[PDB]
Assembly symmetry: D2
Homo-oligomer: 440 residues x 4
């Protein structure tokens, strides 16, 4: 699926509806980013700029101006067309084509921004600006406001009020529209296909990075060129490191491998974690830990619905975890006391869920301890895990095991929809998939 021209227009209007009359909002593009010397990384647009434009160039600024409650318009500053610069570095939109292509009322050259921006802000009461996001942007904005402040003999006046639009825009981004959900739904299918493929390709003697290669190839072939985050392939003890990205080790028969990977499809992030045996067959010790993480996931997927919270569901996961670990002799004592002492924290030291969207760790207010009441349109990860350190004082057979299982969901009117359920997570289904692949 994709995001339509009309959707980008609706988003801008939704922002304008919330702005004060006599105001302007400034949204700046991301700068290009050096990898080494003269070579740059693949360009990644600022998520907020992208949200309002679907425009993937640097040196661009969107200005939305609200004159009053019925009148408003949009100006884009963007790179000029240039034959020499384009024969080298590829095509640019320019000013002539921008109004039509992007649905803005006016487009100006980014090279003229210091001569034009103060003219757009003159006499307004409020400017909405994300201060400290990018240094180049603060320079441009502070420079416009200084001209206006010092220009009273030329009948210029500066807006005295500056408001951060991020709280407002992040609240919009927190609730996904049907179009956004269709995109994320496809991101989830793509990400799942990559995880199925890694399970099917994994053999003892392959390196962790080989599975990374299979995953990226699968993303690419469905049109997701880049991952939404650095892929994690942690076999054995490397699975106890939460963001292990070295992916440098030989995968050994007897070990588990934890794969945490997600594609970026039309800007939107998938995020799946699967843990599975390198040799296609879980040991008893591995099943004992795996079943605790899986029950935590399956219970969470049953509970998440409008009217509950991440905090409330986390409480139920903690109970499942402490209960399971007491039965294995990994924790000792009374379950209720151990829960009150947060005795699970050495083994499960991260949150259960985070928002998901244009960023893998998405924007939006969580509330104290993630107590915010869930409502339809919210998209989140559910990612329980247990990590037993190599030197943990526990029975030998559980030391050095890291297991995480993560699904992505959207809250619906009556419950949730699982966007990532097309990759298996039940241990018998994992084993059948790997056996079937090893034949073929």
């Amino acid at each position: 699926s994709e995001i339509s021209r009309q959707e980008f227009q609706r988003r801008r209007q939704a922002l304008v509806e919330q702005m004060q009359p006599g105001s302007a909002a400034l949204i700046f593009a991301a700068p290009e980013v050096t990898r080494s010397a003269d070579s740059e990384y693949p360009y990644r647009q600022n998520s907020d700029f992208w949200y309002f434009t679907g425009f993937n160039e640097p040196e661009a600024v969107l200005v939305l101006i609200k004159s009053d409650d019925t009148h408003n318009h949009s100006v884009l500053f963007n790179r000029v067309r240039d034959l020499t610069a384009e024969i080298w570095f590829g095509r640019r939109l320019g000013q002539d084509a921008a109004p039509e292509k992007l649905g803005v009322d006016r487009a100006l050259a980014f090279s003229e921004i210091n001569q034009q921006l103060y003219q757009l802000l003159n006499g307004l009461d409020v400017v909405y600006h994300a201060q400290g996001e990018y240094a180049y942007a603060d320079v441009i904005v502070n420079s416009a406001l200084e001209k206006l402040r010092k220009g009273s003999r030329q009948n210029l006046t500066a807006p005295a009020t500056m408001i951060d639009w991020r709280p407002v825009v992040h609240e919009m981004r927190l609730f996904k529209s049907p179009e956004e959900i269709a995109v994320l739904r496809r991101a989830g299918e793509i990400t799942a296909m990559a995880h199925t493929r890694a399970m099917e390709k994994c053999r003892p003697g392959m390196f962790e990075y080989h599975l990374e290669g299979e995953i990226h190839h699968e993303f690419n072939r469905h049109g997701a060129r880049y991952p939404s985050y650095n892929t994690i392939v942690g076999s054995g003890e490397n699975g106890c490191i939460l963001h292990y990205t070295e992916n440098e080790c030989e995968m050994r028969d007897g070990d588990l491998v934890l794969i945490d990977a997600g594609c970026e499809y039309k800007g939107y992030a998938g995020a799946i974690t699967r843990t599975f045996p390198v040799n296609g067959k879980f040991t008893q010790a591995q099943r004992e830990i795996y079943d605790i993480v899986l029950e935590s996931l399956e219970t969470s997927l049953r509970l998440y619905r409008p009217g509950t919270s991440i905090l409330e569901v986390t409480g139920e996961v903690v109970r499942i975890m402490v209960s399971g670990l007491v039965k294995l002799g990994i924790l000792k004592g009374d379950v209720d006391e151990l829960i009150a002492q947060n005795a699970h924290r050495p083994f499960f030291m991260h949150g259960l869920s985070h928002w998901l969207g244009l960023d893998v760790h998405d924007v939006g207010v969580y509330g104290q301890d993630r107590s915010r009441i869930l409502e339809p349109g919210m998209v989140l990860t559910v990612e329980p895990g247990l990590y037993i350190a190599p030197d943990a004082e526990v029975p030998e057979q559980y030391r050095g095991i890291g297991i995480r299982i993560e699904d992505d969901i959207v809250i619906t009117e009556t419950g949730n929809e699982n966007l990532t359920a097309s990759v298996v997570k039940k241990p018998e289904e994992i084993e059948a998939l790997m056996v079937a692949a090893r034949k073929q």
Copy 2:
């Protein structure tokens, strides 16, 4: 192959040999780089820092101190070990293990650098520093020198001389050792295997990005996780854009596809360009242009040897090109006059060769117009191309054709060695490879 501990030691000593007595050289690691919000790009070490250390962490500084012509030592500042930071973001070397692992005499915590660096620079005459490379580094160095300048009542004195070490270090990097050549030799084999695979997989109806996926998968499977630059797959008119990286178009029967891709293997860059027909069979018009570019490459490979220059060989390429284009009726006039008017420039607008090493566009002085005399150990690309614009005033059949063929070579005592010859470039060999693959 790889670079040994002993090689990194030799490089540091070679730098120290050139330093003044009573001096210190400061080499700073690259900062981490944001992709979007809280997520970062895969870390890429500064090439000069990497050259002297093979150490792939941020927040690190190498200080080499020459007391006199027989005494010198090395201090490393680097991140401290930290259980919580490592359970999350993975393992760190720390101070205890650094002296041995990296062959430095002393290692200190990067968090103490502002309390320790001025003590290392006190009373020295010269400091070697790459000013303006990184802002965080200039802050650290200017801050140390200000303490010393203002500390005469505490018997501190600053070095009055600051020298840029980049000219010296870039002259070292320009001449590759046998170990470096073995690494680059393998980078070339890997890069060639990726290009062969793309030729074998290409079918009409695939998208440009699908070939990018095949290439990256092939890099990865030989241990080159990342490309050395953003892969270019330009089919049809997209081949006229020199650094086209959108790779967004459907590849059409009848078109050529230009693939410019290179792996990064142990820090070193491969760089190959191949142009070939999407449908596996060159048309007459396509052969006519291709043969000019190929003769330019083959002649260049014959000529490059110690004692000549990039400028001298470029002169011979220009002659081949203008001569070929006059025979096709793309240029009109006398060949010698057209050469004197630089009449090839609309069609061939970049250099023939650049240095190659830890950076794809490597460091090293070229001399005026690239007239520097070539010597053994220099590694370069040879990359002739012809690009006829869609709207060029030339016979219709040549409009919208972009063809580049690039090989990587090292200058040897008697000539050169071609590091990338294991991927085919003769048109009949390309066609046979694609036919063989289409059967299967």
Copy 3:
């Protein structure tokens, strides 16, 4: 006179009354200012900080916090007491004595500001800050707001709205209270005594700087240690330069001398300009120009009252000037046409009046072309002048004459009060004063 503790309290409350509930206002002290190497200029407090505190130290910040419409409090950050720093650089207020001495509720050490300010701003809706006034202040404020923005897991939130308090505070400063007027009244008496003394001391053969010395001595002896601006003593052609401060020339018999000087008394600026003959007797040519400037001043002093404007009175001055210059043959043509062509501008190129207070060119909105309606409590200068360049194409006898006469006034319920009338300006009174002095 002086400004009472109670007055500073009323001003702070007047600011708080205008603030939104759930907000804080930050007012930063001026930094110390280098004259040369290690030596500094006499400290001059920021006018806005001074206005609210009467506290003459650097490294101080006033924070006014409005919790709601009935509750608010004040925190001062200021330098800690320190025996060694004080034996050297003199006494400091410290934290213990500040609440009582300055009438603030709490005082904290300036050295702890980065650890305490974000705690004061946490959870507020609005912060009032003069952005771009001082760089050290912006660093402190941006740093507090970044901690809050990134501290949601610690239950911190930043105020999303930032408002410039300068418009509000400058509107307060524009209207002087009775206490302020008593201070300015004394500043005017002191400044007048200095100008009388310069007229009485002036002899041919003295240097311009000698009169500067007499003026500064007179300021000092009444308790005004510093001038409010760099004293101007322009004799002859130097009087045509509006802010001549070289004061380097020998004063010649036959020349006029223009003295523009003003004391700073309790922070408040006097500003008087007088022009008079070096030899104590005006020539006919000098009287002809002087009488035009004097009529402009005397008429202005009659007209200024509530309900008129600087623009309206300037119109009447322009008429007097153009009329006078036509009678001398300095302008040729019809008076109404010459007025419409602004034909006075080569000879009178500055404004008639500016606001006066804690700054000589004081804060406050003038309106387009200085059209703002005057109201009681406004304090302004009235400073007509005529400057005929040495090379002006006018009758020889008027070339190189610069004449300015400036008085300071406060608008009252029925008219104005002249704060500077105790120094003579009528030519016969000037001459009598100088004759009497020469006997002384």
Copy 4:
């Protein structure tokens, strides 16, 4: 006296003689300095810029270029002439008049510096620059060097070596020429006349600031418009504060007053301190302390000569002081032991002598503990003092006494010349001067 055109030329040549061939030295003018809002302090040129030019404008840069051991030239960047800017803010030198007036070979507009400076530095080996002195200067220099570094395709190269010229220039400034000594000699006469006048004007009931006024008036009348530092008038307990500049107290019969003041004459600083009784008659307790400080001064003036050091003479002063304080019962114990314990430090906590020149605390290397061997042409202060705190545990009659007596001297071939001896310091001579004045 004054400094000649020829002297400024000799200084520049002396710097050039020490520069490497193929180099340039950049000396930047001081920026203008805000006092309050739009008003600025009296301009004070950078001492090093002034030393080489005698040019008192901002926005100026001197570039001295040494091509080789016999060829060199000077370029000045300075403000362009501008009729409007000059009618307002006074006259400028401009480019046409600069070569002749200042003895430079070429003059360019400061507004073109970013377009011209890199052209002057292109292809040089060394640049001499005082890094971190002024931020605007570092911006200009870093910007020129970045253009050159990145301009190799345009055949530009940057100098790789940057050397701080301050050590060299400060060593030149440390040794005064005969012309400089004649200027300082007159600065000393002027400063002495001011101190004599303050002694003659002082009466009980005057404020400390009134004596400041008398002193500044006396400076001004001899052509020293500004003090070289903020005048100190500390009566009573205020004399125990080393840099007391509040000068706010009523001078009381029975108290001493310590006056520390110095004029700035042609850029050069006088610096005299005198202590004397407000009522013109020393008490016994006051004489007891005064005689110790005076013996310290008189002995120092006998000892200072080529071949000794500030450290060596300080040792003799410490002995005189500890010996005197033991006789008064202010210190108890054996003199040699008390000296070894540095028992004088509570009462005499600053150095005896500092260099004096264009800065009151002048440039030049002192050596460890000020052990540098004195040579002819060095100019220094000799300023012993004793400060007994109000709460010191000593006999009551000595509490709250601060006494400093300071003279300025130049080292000569056989001894020293006292530049400030024309103001009295013997107590009977002080008393006779004050009695004579009271009759006024």
